A paper describes a structure:
Like bacterial and mitochondrial complex IIs with known structures, which includes SQRs from Escherichia coli, chicken and porcine as well as QFR from E. coli, the structure of A. suum QFR is composed of Fp (chain A), Ip (chain B), CybL (chain C) and CybS (chain D) subunits. Notably, the A. suum QFR is evolutionally more closely related to the bacterial and mitochondrial SQR (including the larval SQR of A. suum) than to bacterial QFR. In contrast to the hydrophilic Fp and Ip subunits, the hydrophobic CybL and CybS subunits consist of three membrane-spanning α-helices that anchor A. suum QFR to the mitochondrial inner membrane. The interface between the CybL and CybS subunits binds a heme b molecule with coordination bonds from two conserved His 131C and His 95D residues. The RQ binding site of A. suum QFR is constructed by Ip, CybL and CybS subunits and is located in the mitochondrial inner membrane near the surface of the matrix side. This is probably due to the steric hindrance between the bulky side chain of SQR Ile 43C and the bound UQ, obstructing the formation of hydrogen bonds. In A. suum QFR, Gly 73C occupies the position of SQR’s Ile 43C. Furthermore, while the quinone rings of the bound RQ and UQ forms hydrogen bonds with residues of quinone binding sites, the isoprene tails extend toward the entrances of the quinone binding sites located in the mitochondrial inner membrane and are not in close contact with amino acid residues.
The enzymes of the fumarate respiration are anchored in the inner mitochondrial membrane where complex I (NADH-rhodoquinone reductase) acts as a proton pump that is driven by the oxidation of NADH to NAD+ and coupled to the reduction of rhodoquinone (RQ) to rhodoquinol (RQH2), while complex II, serving as a RQH2-fumarate reductase (QFR), transfers electrons from RQH2 to fumarate. Since fumarate respiration is the major pathway of energy metabolism during adaptation to a hypoxic environment for many species of parasites including adult A. suum and bacteria inhabiting anaerobic environments as well as some human cancer cells exposed to low nutrition and low oxygen conditions, the pathway is one of the most promising targets of chemotherapy for both parasitic diseases and cancer. In spite of the similarity in amino acid sequences and three-dimensional structures between A. suum QFR and porcine SQR, flutolanil specifically inhibits the enzymatic action of A. suum QFR.
Residue numbers in the entry:
A (entry chain C): 34 to 186
B (entry chain A): 30 to 645
C (entry chain D): 28 to 156
D (entry chain B): 33 to 282
The structure:
Amino acid sequence: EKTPIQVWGWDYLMRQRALKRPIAPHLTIYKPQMTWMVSGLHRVTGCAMAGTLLIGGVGFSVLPLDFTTFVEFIRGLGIPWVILDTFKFIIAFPIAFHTLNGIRFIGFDMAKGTDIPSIYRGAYLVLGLAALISLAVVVYPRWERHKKATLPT
Amino acid sequence: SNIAQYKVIDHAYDVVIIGAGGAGLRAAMGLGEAGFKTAVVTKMFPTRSHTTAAQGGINAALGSMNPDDWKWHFYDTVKGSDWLGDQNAMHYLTRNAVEAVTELENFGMPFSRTPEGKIYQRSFGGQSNNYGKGGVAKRTCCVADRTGHSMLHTLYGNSLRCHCTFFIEYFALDLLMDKGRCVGVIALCLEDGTIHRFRSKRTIVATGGYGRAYFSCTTAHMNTGDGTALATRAGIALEDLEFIQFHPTGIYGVGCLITEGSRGEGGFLVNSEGERFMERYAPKAKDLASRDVVSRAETIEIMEGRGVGPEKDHIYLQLHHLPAEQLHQRLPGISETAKIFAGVDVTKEPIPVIPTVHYNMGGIPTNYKAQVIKYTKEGGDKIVPGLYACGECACHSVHGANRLGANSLLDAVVFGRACSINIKEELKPDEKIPELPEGAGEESIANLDAVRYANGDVPTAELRLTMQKTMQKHAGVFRRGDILAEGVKKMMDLFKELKRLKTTDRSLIWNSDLTESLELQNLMLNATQTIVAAENRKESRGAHARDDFPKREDEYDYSKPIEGQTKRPFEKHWRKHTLTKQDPRTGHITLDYRPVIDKTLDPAEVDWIPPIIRSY
Amino acid sequence: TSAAVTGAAPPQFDPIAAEKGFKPLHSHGTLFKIERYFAAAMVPLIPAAYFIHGREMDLCLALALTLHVHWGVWGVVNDYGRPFVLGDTLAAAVRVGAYIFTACLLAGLLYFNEHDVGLTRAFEMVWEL
Amino acid sequence: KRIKTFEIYRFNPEEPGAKPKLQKFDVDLDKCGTMVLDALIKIKNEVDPTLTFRRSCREGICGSCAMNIAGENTLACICNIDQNTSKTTKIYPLPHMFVIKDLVPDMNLFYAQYASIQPWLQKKTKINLGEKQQYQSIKEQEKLDGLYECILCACCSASCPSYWWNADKYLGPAVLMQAYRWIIDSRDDSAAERLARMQDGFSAFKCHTIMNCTKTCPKHLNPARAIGEIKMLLTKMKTKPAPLPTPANF
Ligand SMILES: Cc1cc2nc3c(=O)[nH]c(=O)nc-3n(C[C@H](O)[C@H](O)[C@H](O)COP(=O)(O)OP(=O)(O)OC[C@H]3O[C@@H](n4cnc5c(N)ncnc54)[C@H](O)[C@@H]3O)c2cc1C
Ligand code: HEM
Ligand SMILES: COC1=C(N)C(=O)C(C)=C(C/C=C(\C)CCC=C(C)C)C1=O
Ligand code: SF4
Ligand code: F3S
Ligand code: FES
């Protein structure tokens, strides 16, 4: 159930298709900027994490495989410890970033922080805090394993 | 005609309005809500009209800042017109200012406010209290620095509620005449290259001015005098075209306006000797003298070695002594324009400025009901049936030889409104949408085709450019018979070069090489008429300054007492309107003169104002 | 030449005409409100799951992520799954795909919590690598 | 000779099975004005008069010359040409509009949507037109600052991906900021009807806070703030203040 302009809007689109008028390019030509890039990443992350929770949840239930033999399988590959923690960063960033930026965006919905400099300060803070929080949550367990392996008590 | 074929589409309307500036929209509002099936033909989206560039304000004696009377305003307008203004139309204008500006506020025009919540007003050039005798007036109502922008958007918004029908990006080519009557308009639809004839009982011309006839101007690219040209092609004579307002303060390099409101708010002009020279040229009013006076004062300074900058060829507007909260509050727009186009920070540096073509008090001649007229000595003023004209394209004449600042947005609205009032009173359901004569519009189509496929050797851009330069040179702030005669001969030669015209784009769809060529034709008609009229007027009046004839030539010598003088006969003085008839194929122009109307609409409501020497 | 045809008013939205009849009070305000309140509440929930693990938390994650992802994919579906680009029935399919996506997400999460290690242990375990 | 070079989008609807194309033009900057519009006119005037675009004002007030220049939406007439003659400058129409010819977009939906907000003052109690000024305090009129200035160039809406995908249903930054301009007008009595018009899931709420609109607006306005403002109103988090009462001896 559409508003009158929404109906009109639809007929306009059909009128334009009928005239086989081209559509002016957009994605391919718009300058990359910290406004829509950081919106882009909010959606990619949201969707990536949802995609994972489907392919993880349905995947392991439909397949004879279970999570435990999957973990021990990769453990068995014995891959360099440096890389392993990078995978753990790639997994944490989206949760941190998207969560922080989610508070930002909620701000935006309340008309808070919409001036251009607040916007840009906010984008760096969110990107940065998420870089920190993700790195910290990976570095800390390792840091504490190395302490178990190499210190007195 | 000839080399291609054209789709032709007919319509039927009660009235057709050619223009959606302030004037056309106000008429459209009036007529629409009155029931008339009203069509608005404009060559650009209404909001892009030049009205939207207006800045400093709109006049009405509201008394928001101090007591005021509309008769003081009236006096200021008559004196402003240097007695070439018709006092009936000027009476109508000033009488209605308060109601007119008030309506705008009621439509939602967001005027700047006073601490009492009334419409803030400012001082402007050429305005006084108490019939000249009091102080500088505060009559000029504004939305900061963007009064026309705001007004045009308010008028456009409200037009959408008055059931008009918009033909947007339609370029009118001619009025459709049937034996002295106007029965419609013919136009090219830019979108799909088609040709539309609108039939109507009434047609309103509201097409703006012709600033682009000059090389430097404040006006928009679309200011090409198509309306005045339409009237020429319908065999109607144009009025007072030689009276071309130079605004004191266009930015030096680029022609952009800097509002006279910046002087109303306390700015002033300065020469290379650091002198507020308008103290010298106009001791009372100073920097708020009339525009013709201030622009001349500026030009002399330049001619007399006191010009500013590298070439000492312009002058400074100074605002930096004004509080920065006033500049932002009262002149945010020009603060921005000045930075963008001159690198200038108005809080610290002054703006480089120079007088610049700005406004046309000339136009299509009308009566005070805005009905278009033809004139003869024998017959007098004869109205052209079906045809009204208003706004800058019109000559009512509410401005005579010099238009007062903030009176034009006003005259657009007031006489835009008058068009609707007067048509709803005189038009009866009795009358039916007239039928077109056989072949109607063929000439206009033929011309269109010719220009479309024109394969001569002069590209229109260069022909235009020579016209603009010719005009800047031979019809500027100060004029001389020999320079004028020279100019005229060049202009009529350029008009001959129209036959050698080269265009390139041959499409019917959004062909702006074509419309710009059509525009050149219209410009040339205006420009040629302008110059032969100016050439022939051997006096100095308002904006028309002749170095060989520095006197204002009236029926008496109003600088001495009247008694004992014998009135000079009409043919011997110059207190009369100029009428130019032009044959559009050949270019041949004939002149005639029509008497100024001196009476008001009612001597009981207000007296007339007899000429006196014009000082400030 | 003027051997010509009769014309039509251009296409033009008449907002007075449009007003007549139209009431529809189909207010999406409170759904938008709750969507946002919900995400706000998930802020403390994410770090909570960093510290507290187990079945009951695994269940709070599954319920809240499911709800939040349901509203989320519905938005993205309405952006790229538009009748203008996919035609009207393929559009309706993708819209139905939004709901199918949500249900399978939940079933697969309920399964993982009930018959596998569960959410907070699975993370716990990949972090142990 | 500092020769700047311009790659300009081209489209010719007259051509049989026509298709979009970039064209390169060389311009002698010493023979040209400071602004991008100057270069386009120069080309049209000297090189190719078939090149087609909208323009009217000189000072960036009309809103006609809106286009995409060096990847951003702005007005040509006040966009300074980049002096670096080593780089070229790319010029396209407004993103994701249907093009008529070259840089000229069909603009008619944008205008339709604008008509739909009912952009005129509305009063619950009929008033006699022209008879007296309505009262409005400075503080109240100053709420319109940053709203009334919009020139309807559509740079913002042509920058918003949300509007790119759902222009037919989502009103866009420009139209919504005007919707808001009429909502917070202390003199206007229809703030509720104004919101009822845009209650559905798309009209306003398809704003994904991308912030492109505000980034790109050539008049330094903030349609995002206004949309947040509208979101608050639709969700009843905020309410429009009553008008301050008119003074006794007004
Ligand atoms: C920079 C500037 C600032 C100004 N500031 C002020 C001020 O502060 N106060 C004041 O009183 N005055 C001011 N003026 C003067 C005033 O703005 C104008 O005289 C006034 O707006 C006249 O408008 P109009 O409606 O007659 O025509 P315009 O506003 O120019 O509009 C003319 C209309 O006619 C249409 N048209 C023209 N030719 C054709 C054709 N062939 N086919 C179809 N349509 C056509 C156009 O599309 C347009 O809609 C200013 C002028 C300028 C240039
Ligand atoms: C922990 C706190 C979280 C907050 C505060 C939060 C907040 C938000 C907000 C405000 C939006 C709306 C964006 C928009 O309308 O454009 C959103 C979208 C989304 N979120 Fe989250 N979120 C969180 C966690 C998650 C998680 C764990 C997932 C896991 C899959 C997720 C997936 C999504 C998806 C798919 C969208 C739609 C994206 C879009 O339309 O651009 N979110 N989130
Ligand atoms: C409104 O959703 C979107 C964003 N939030 C965002 O930041 C970006 C960059 C986009 C751009 C869309 C992309 C990359 C998907 C491709 C869709 C096509 C029709 C080609 C978007 O749609
Ligand atoms: S907001 Fe800025 S950009 Fe969007 S229309 Fe108004 S002016 Fe053009
Ligand atoms: S760019 Fe688009 S989605 Fe919202 S904040 Fe601005 S409108
Ligand atoms: S020509 Fe008016 S915005 Fe550029």
